[PDB]
Amino acid sequence: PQDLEFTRLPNGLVIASLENYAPASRIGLFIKAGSRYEDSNNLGTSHLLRLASSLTTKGASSFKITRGIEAVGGKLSVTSTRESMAYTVECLRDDIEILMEFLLNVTAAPEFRRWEVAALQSQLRIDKAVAFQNPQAQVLENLHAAAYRNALANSLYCPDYRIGKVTPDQLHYYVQNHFTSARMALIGLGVSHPVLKQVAERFLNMRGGLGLSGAKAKYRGGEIRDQNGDSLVHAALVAESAATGSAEANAFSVLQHVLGAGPHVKRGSNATSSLYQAVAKGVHQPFDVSAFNASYSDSGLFGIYTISQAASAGDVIKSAYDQVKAIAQGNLSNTDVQAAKNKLKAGYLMSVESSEGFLDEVGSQALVAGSYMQPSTVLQQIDSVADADVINAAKKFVSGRKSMAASGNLGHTPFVDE
């Protein structure tokens, strides 16, 4: 009922105002900052920005904020990827007028006092050592540096030679160049339209102009191997792939569901994947193989990912490469292609059935496209891929230049020449 109501402003901004009838409401702000906009002199500035959402601001202190929200039952969270940042707040239906006079105050007009900012800098060590207890946040940071040269290669965590030295002067400048009113989108889920604009008149008057935006992300082939103490080997291989919103994109999304990329029935041997079946032939030991994908705005990556024992880590990678070769020079059906169309349609719809997976979908495609497409249009995109577009896409992976990145006990693992 009245599904969405777009509106653009003269400066250029996006506000979306769906209206529903539940005693809850969520608000969001989307910005085009990230970890890809920092050069060689100020690495790690954007990891310390998302820890400092609670410090003292111009219009309110840090006592009135950490305690005027918590007397009502609300929350603040900040999430970030390699190119976007999001601020989100929630509470009950009658208490939302007061939480939008805290959120717009955190981002528009902050301060950075010397004594406070010098105290957060042990939080970098604590936060970074927690995330790195998963053996897979490590190996996916050695894989972006092994394939790119400038912009996309920076990580999401602060380098450790660099922890005591982030100043209040590097932060005032990063904000002032990348937080801008032609760069942002404002989304309101269970609220009305005449009131969302009422707030934006005090959000755009300052610092309107677009910022620097450089460093076109050129491609390099470097390989990194790290040997430590782990009892199981984690490895990868990628090659360049086509970027989001084109027509060759959907031939790589359909392709991966043919190979693998997830189980459905718990505690049960997969029967639906090309990759998994051709590996268990031969090898007799615990193992794990996937598929991998990413669709950034100017380029993409695509490949495989393994987990296995140390004494047999060459057989697993070699076997998983013979199967992907077979599809390249002609082997495919019209039933398995059809099934992969169903795993992609169903999975898309379920991820927009909650109420936090519905802001993100609306909020990310009002930045890089400027409009909203109802899921009834999107279901047409997937279905009308020619077959023999899946064959063509898998032909390009076999004929590229590859990045490796292995992290365990590397005594039987192969270098990338084989």
């Binding site: 927690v130 897979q136 999304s253 189980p263 898309y348 993100d360």
Partner: protein, 57 residues
């Protein structure tokens, strides 16, 4: 299908004022440990167990 999270496998971390830190989306899933022997190390400046945040009331 924008929103790179919809393309299954690059990470994103989260941090809040009331809930504990979060990290990423699927690189693995189940049936990696449903075959036996996933030892899962523990207590190294302990990260939480199951990250108790969601109650039913």
């Amino acid at each position: 299908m924008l929103s790179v999270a919809s393309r299954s496998g690059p990470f994103a971390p989260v941090l809040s004022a009331t809930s504990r830190g979060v990290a990423g989306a699927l690189r693995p899933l189940v049936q990696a440990a449903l075959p036996a022997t996933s030892e899962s190390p523990v207590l190294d400046a302990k990260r939480s167990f199951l990250c108790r945040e969601s109650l039913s009331g």
